[PDB]
Design an enzyme around this catalytic site. Structure first.
Site, short mmCIF file in Angstrom:
data_model
loop_
_atom_site.label_atom_id
_atom_site.label_comp_id
_atom_site.label_asym_id
_atom_site.label_seq_id
_atom_site.Cartn_x
_atom_site.Cartn_y
_atom_site.Cartn_z
N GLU A 1 0.78 -1.23 0.00
CA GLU A 1 0.00 0.00 0.00
C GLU A 1 0.82 1.29 0.00
O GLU A 1 0.30 2.34 -0.36
CB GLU A 1 -0.94 0.02 1.23
CG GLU A 1 -1.81 -1.22 1.34
CD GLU A 1 -2.97 -1.23 0.35
OE1 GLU A 1 -3.60 -2.29 0.16
OE2 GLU A 1 -3.25 -0.17 -0.23
N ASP B 1 -6.85 5.94 -4.98
CA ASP B 1 -6.27 4.60 -5.08
C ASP B 1 -6.33 4.06 -6.51
O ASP B 1 -6.64 4.81 -7.42
CB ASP B 1 -6.92 3.67 -4.08
CG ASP B 1 -8.34 3.30 -4.47
OD1 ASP B 1 -9.00 2.64 -3.65
OD2 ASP B 1 -8.81 3.67 -5.57
N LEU C 1 -9.02 3.51 2.94
CA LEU C 1 -10.09 4.04 2.10
C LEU C 1 -10.97 5.03 2.85
O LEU C 1 -11.43 4.77 3.96
CB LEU C 1 -10.93 2.87 1.60
CG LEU C 1 -12.01 3.19 0.57
CD1 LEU C 1 -13.32 3.46 1.27
CD2 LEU C 1 -11.59 4.41 -0.26
N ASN D 1 -6.30 -20.69 -10.08
CA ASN D 1 -7.65 -20.24 -9.93
C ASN D 1 -7.64 -18.80 -9.43
O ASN D 1 -8.41 -17.99 -9.90
CB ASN D 1 -8.40 -21.10 -8.92
CG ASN D 1 -9.87 -20.81 -8.89
OD1 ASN D 1 -10.38 -20.11 -8.02
ND2 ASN D 1 -10.56 -21.27 -9.92
#
Ligand SMILES: [Cl-]
Ligand SMILES: [Cl-]
EC number: 3.2.1.17
Length: 164
Positions: free
Chosen positions: A11, A20, A32, A132
């Site tokens: 971050e 962001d 956030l 996946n």
């Protein structure tokens, strides 16, 4: 390496409001503030979170405080989630960090949607889970961070965060 260092690397740290990767107003270490397009909504949320008139700017101690609160909440959020908890409890200490990383970035709800990857991690089919996990918008939008996290799930080592 630990979760705080891992996320600090993913971050970064910024003491002034910024946008962001999705265009949302954020501050500190990936905290956030709002999904709203208004910079004043953001400045409002900011003061509310810090408890003083910030005018869009914070101190390093303040950023670190939000950070701790945020890691704590991600953890608790995983423990409260019926789909997440069992996976998290099944993981070794390095890999738990990878799960925390995802929840920190996309929220509990978002991670809980990775049903098949989740089942695969639970069964400890590392390579299968990695492939996946890669078939997602997450990997496509933030590939470098996704690769680091996936590599972590695949190996159970901090190799991907080494040399950063
Ligand atoms: Cl895809
Ligand atoms: Cl990235």
């Amino acid at each position: 390496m630990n979760i705080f260092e891992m996320l600090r690397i993913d971050e970064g740290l910024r003491l002034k409001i910024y946008k962001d990767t999705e265009g949302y107003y954020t501050i500190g270490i990936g905290h956030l503030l709002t999904k709203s397009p208004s910079l004043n909504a953001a400045k409002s949320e900011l003061d509310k979170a810090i408890g003083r008139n910030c005018n869009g700017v914070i101190t390093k101690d303040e950023a670190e405080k939000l950070f701790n609160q945020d890691v704590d909440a991600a953890v608790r959020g995983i423990l409260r989630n019926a789909k997440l908890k069992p996976v998290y409890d099944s993981l070794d200490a390095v890999r738990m960090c990878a799960l925390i990383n995802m929840v920190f970035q996309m929220g509990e709800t978002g991670v809980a949607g990775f049903t098949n990857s989740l089942r695969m991690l639970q069964q400890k089919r590392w390579d299968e889970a990695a492939v996946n996990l890669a078939k997602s918008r997450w990997y496509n939008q933030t590939p470098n961070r996704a690769k680091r996290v996936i590599t972590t799930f695949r190996t159970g080592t901090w190799d991907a965060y080494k040399n950063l």
